[PDB]
Amino acid sequence: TGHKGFSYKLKLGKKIHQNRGVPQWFRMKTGNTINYNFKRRHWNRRKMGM
Amino acid sequence: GIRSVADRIRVRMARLPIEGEEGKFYTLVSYVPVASFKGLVTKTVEEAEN
């Protein structure tokens, strides 16, 4: 909704921040196994349920 | 409209060289309006003027 509580909006912003991939420099670390973030979601694929 | 087309259409199509590649030709079909279709046969249109 347009109308929302202040703390609810900040939890919406955090979910936007966490919907990002692994940076390139992190993928070049030695002994690295983290290439894709599996905690990723999209608005039309999975509803975050909050 | 999409449902009705004229019974007889008089067209003039000329073959001209393609500007880019000299070997090939292309046909330009244009529409010539006529008052009536009586006594109109296939012709060849030649300018033959300076």
Binding site: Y8, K11, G49, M50 | -
Partner: protein, 72 residues
């Protein structure tokens, strides 16, 4: 019409986020949380829910103060 059609009017939340346990388990009309048992002072735990006990209990979090007291 009890299947596909009746689901169109589902746009009112029964539960919102809880302040104490952080789960979307706060019943708005009941005014209590179904997961942590909010305003009730004691955290809601049951012996038949053995998995629910190992999902949120001591040691499942940061242990900010107790990690120092025990090692001392």
């Amino acid at each position: 019409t009890k299947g596909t059609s009746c689901r169109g009017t589902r746009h009112n939340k029964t539960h919102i986020l809880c302040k104490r346990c952080g789960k979307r388990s706060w019943h708005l009309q009941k005014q209590r949380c179904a997961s942590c048992g909010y305003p009730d002072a004691k955290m809601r735990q049951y012996a038949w829910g053995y998995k629910a006990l190992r999902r949120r209990t001591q040691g499942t979090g940061r242990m900010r103060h107790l990690k120092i007291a025990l090692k001392r």
